[PDB]
Design a protein around this ligand. Structure first.
Ligand SMILES: CNC(=O)c1cc(Oc2ccc(NC(=O)Nc3ccc(Cl)c(C(F)(F)F)c3)cc2)ccn1
Length: 333
């Protein structure tokens, strides 16, 4: 067992192993830190009140379970997970050790203008990380530029914190009510991000969920009868058919002189019918990614157990299960 040191950072008390040094404030309580074991700079996240309720406790276990499973170059990873607690009995705090994100995707644009090669590389990497995530039966559901970390080498990872409104990137099926989300809600978001990288502008800068859906309809059209077949709710249907028919615009016209192959892929991503949306594994083999695509270096995830999601449990049970997950952590190479 490591040896800890306490400090006030700030009005919060931080208890971390000596391995982590020079903590400075940077989610909900993150310090940048020097990881003296690897020589690297890390994000250390201290969770506030992880076990305060059943919902908080489930949330905490869910995040720990997910971070521990994520083992991909284009996806956030868990460098370490620690508690000062010695026993289940004194177990109250959970700290997450992640690589430090400097700039997100927006910070990267609001620095410099992007080549078509940059869009290719950036969107390649989002899709390759998403391929991995989707294959674990996980759906991100909040993909947007603030959830994507990009280094000085323009290398990218997917994360989720919890600009930059989530709605601008939301699939239309989410802003009505579903549920019965499929994975390609995440492809819509990617579509929305990719257009914005090309255009330098928010594709659907809705003022709210209504104005949002108005903007979406202009570009892609109002649904046709084959999509209207699949809509269950009575209205639901008395909004879409109660709104004047719109033609599906010509993407080539809307997307300027962007690369015509980026215009093709966009078309295939921003389909109003979630069933006809290109998947991540399909998007990787698109001609826009010819310079980056390698069928043999686009890995999938190990099987991922999320049966816990159907369980309603007590705070102490969620908390014990988180404690196990903390104890069974195997630090990566
Ligand atoms: C400017 N510096 C910082 O503020 C800072 C804070 C950091 O802390 C973080 C610590 C943990 C997480 N947890 C996730 O990301 N959770 C996640 C949930 C669902 C899903 Cl689906 C995924 C996914 F997609 F990856 F798989 C990831 C996010 C950020 C890291 C780096 N930098």
């Amino acid at each position: 067992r490591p040896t800890f040191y306490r400090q006030e950072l700030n009005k919060t008390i931080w208890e971390v192993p000596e391995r982590y040094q020079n903590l400075s404030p940077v989610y909900g309580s993150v310090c940048a830190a020097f990881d003296t074991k690897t020589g690297l700079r890390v994000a250390v996240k201290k969770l506030s009140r992880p076990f305060q309720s059943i919902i908080h406790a489930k949330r905490t276990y869910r995040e720990l379970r997910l971070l521990k499973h994520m083992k991909h170059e284009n996806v956030i990873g868990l460098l370490d997970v620690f508690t000062p607690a010695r026993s289940l009995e004194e177990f109250n705090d959970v700290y997450l050790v992640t690589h430090l994100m400097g700039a997100d995707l927006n910070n990267i644009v609001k620095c410099q203008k992007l080549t078509d090669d940059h869009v290719q590389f950036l969107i390649y990497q989002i899709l390759r990380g998403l391929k991995y995530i989707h294959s674990a039966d996980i759906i991100h559901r909040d993909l947007k530029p603030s959830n994507l970390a990009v280094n000085e080498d323009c290398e990218l990872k997917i994360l989720d914190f919890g600009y930059v409104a989530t709605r601008w990137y939301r699939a239309p099926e989410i802003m009505l009510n579903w549920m019965h989300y499929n994975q390609t809600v995440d492809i819509w978001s990617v579509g929305c991000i990719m257009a914005e990288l090309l255009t330098g502008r928010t594709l659907f800068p809705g003022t709210d969920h209504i104005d949002q859906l108005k903007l979406i309809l202009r570009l892609v059209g109002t649904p046709g009868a084959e999509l209207l077949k699949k809509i269950s709710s009575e209205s639901a249907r008395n909004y879409i058919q109660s709104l004047t028919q719109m033609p599906k615009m010509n993407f080539a016209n809307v997307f300027i002189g962007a690369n015509p192959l980026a215009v093709d892929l966009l078309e295939k991503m921003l389909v109003l019918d979630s069933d006809k949306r290109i998947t991540a594994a399909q998007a990787l083999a698109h001609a826009y990614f010819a310079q980056y695509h390698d069928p043999d270096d686009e890995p999938v995830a190990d099987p991922y157990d999320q049966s816990f999601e159907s369980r309603d449990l007590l705070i102490d049970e969620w908390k014990s299960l988180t404690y196990d997950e903390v104890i069974s952590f195997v630090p990566p190479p």
